[PDB]
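Notes continue from the previous slide.

Worked example: a multi-chain complex. Inputs as given:
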Amino acid sequence: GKKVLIVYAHQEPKSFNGSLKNVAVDELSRQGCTVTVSDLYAMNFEPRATDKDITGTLSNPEVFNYGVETHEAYKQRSLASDITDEQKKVREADLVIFQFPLYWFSVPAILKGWMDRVLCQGFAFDIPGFYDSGLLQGKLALLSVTTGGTAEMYTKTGVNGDSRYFLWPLQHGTLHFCGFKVLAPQISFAPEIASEEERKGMVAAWSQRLQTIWKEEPIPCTAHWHFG
Amino acid sequence: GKKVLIVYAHQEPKSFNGSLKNVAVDELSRQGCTVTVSDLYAMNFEPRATDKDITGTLSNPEVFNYGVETHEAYKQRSLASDITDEQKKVREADLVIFQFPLYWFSVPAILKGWMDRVLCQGFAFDIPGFYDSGLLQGKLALLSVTTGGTAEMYTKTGVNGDSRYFLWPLQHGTLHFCGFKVLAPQISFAPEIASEEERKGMVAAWSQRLQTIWKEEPIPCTAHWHF
Ligand SMILES: Cc1cc2nc3c(=O)[nH]c(=O)nc-3n(C[C@H](O)[C@H](O)[C@H](O)COP(=O)(O)OP(=O)(O)OC[C@H]3O[C@@H](n4cnc5c(N)ncnc54)[C@H](O)[C@@H]3O)c2cc1C
Ligand SMILES: COc1ccc2c([nH]1)c(CCNC(=O)c1ccco1)c1c3ncccc3cn21
Ligand SMILES: COc1ccc2c([nH]1)c(CCNC(=O)c1ccco1)c1c3ncccc3cn21
Ligand SMILES: [Zn+2]
Ligand SMILES: [Zn+2]
């Protein structure tokens, strides 16, 4: 038995991202997995890192440091409840899937906000207790990303450079840093340009991959893998 | 003369980021430059890309495509006023400085939101106006970043890898894509672990660099430079 959290960042239920999220839910549910989705836009998830995220007495009310105060709030259990709700989902998950369209070679701001606010010191990592020693060790993570650009544009000699280049801050800087084992990304290239057959094919490829996801090994999340 | 926009993303006026923004204002003002600051947290800037970003009626009320809708809204002068207020500042700017603490090898979400919502198709880029032909061509941009990790950690064989690795999506994927000439990043490594005078020294070096900012040539914003 396994628990899966899908963190989902798209405004439109009928979108290609919506479909990839839905097929994930369908297929994991079919397998008998326990599945939770955080639909960030539907939740109106707060992306801003602010002093509203701590409810108790601040450690240093004279000079607000978000990282310091949230670390302390985590230990004290005085974080805002929207944060702790997400932390509970992550804590219990065996696999966390991020489903999102690429926005400026990265995640949409609403999802960046989830990373900034949910993955606080004490919960996701400590010093020491990061990268291979991160607090979310044992967990798997996977980026399921859609793009405007074609596969050709995301090559070493394409205009955008290789797709692995933009994965670095997310796979290494974030997921690996927290101790996740990172599974190979699912990149669904240019669904807007693609034909009806091609789009249905990309959806089916994701569904098919998920059939055997529990048998996958993670990538070596290193500079070499990303950059060569 | 010259116009500068500083897009600033820190919660605390007394912060090291706050000090860097303040000396940028001081020095550029001293030079006679026109200076505007977008203090995102003070503005409670909206980071989320939503249908509220379009006023009046949507291009397609049945299926919402943020990219299409905002492109059309830009052309039809129907974007939300927070977005258009920022676009005006950007349009008029000769130099855009981003001042922020590194969050997860990237910009804080509030600043990511500024990028997502302000830099829409038709304004910041289109086909074929991208990279070298981007619609903001002729403008300069500069990332002024502070880190928690020390300089040593950001070496190519350090735990975090080279600083240039995380700069790719921001400098190339975003700034260069919009046509910006990208000035060398100002990176202030690990201010929190002091010292008082080392902190004073980093602030001072930023101020000093700003003295001859208009003399600078942009970096070659390429895969080779970063990797
Ligand atoms: C969500 C989140 C994600 C993060 N991700 C990363 C990451 O991926 N990689 C990474 O390396 N780091 C990361 N960090 C750490 C973060 O980048 C640093 O905490 C931040 O850069 C420090 O800058 P600051 O302005 O907040 O420092 P401050 O704490 O504000 O400054 C340090 C000290 O300088 C003092 N000071 C202010 N002005 C002056 C002055 N003029 N002269 C002398 N002293 C002065 C202040 O009083 C303070 O005591 C993350 C932090 C958070 C909260
Ligand atoms: C403050 O609160 C926070 C919150 C989140 C952080 C964070 N600090 C740091 C910096 C951690 N300290 C140090 O390396 C340090 C302290 C002294 C010398 O080096 C980092 C990251 N560094 C790399 C990759 C992802 C990171 C997320 N985060
Ligand atoms: C309006 O919707 C948007 C908003 C912002 C975008 C965007 N599309 C695209 C994809 C642009 N299309 C194509 O490559 C393309 C070619 C042929 C058909 O499509 C990109 C980016 N691509 C690379 C780097 C940054 C980017 C920012 N943005
Ligand atoms: Zn890694
Ligand atoms: Zn470039």
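Summary box: The CA atoms of residues 24 and 207 of chain B lie 6 Å apart. Chain B touches chain A through 49 residues (CB under 8 Å).
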